[PDB]
């Protein structure tokens, strides 16, 4: 997970960050994801699921 940012606001985003990017992969709505994920307040979401740099 990015630094700095808001990329998990107290619970981890990188090890579900693979979730998204399965998801998202196939065509999975991310936001959808994004609950799996479990990253508190949209503040990050708002940031990851639109950029969200995995790579
Ligand atoms: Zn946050």
């Known amino acids: 997970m990015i630094p700095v940012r808001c990329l998990?606001?107290?619970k981890?985003?990188?090890?579900?960050?693979?979730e998204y990017?399965?998801?998202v992969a196939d065509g999975e709505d991310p936001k959808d994801v994004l609950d799996?994920?479990?990253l508190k307040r949209?503040?990050?979401?708002?940031?990851l699921?639109?950029?969200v740099e995995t790579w």
């Open 49 to 51: 699921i639109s950029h």
């Open 12 to 18: 981890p985003v990188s090890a579900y960050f693979n």
């Open 42 to 47: 949209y503040c990050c979401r708002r940031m």
């Open 36 to 38: 799996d994920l479990g």
């Open 8 to 10: 998990s606001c107290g």
């Open 21 to 23: 990017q399965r998801r």
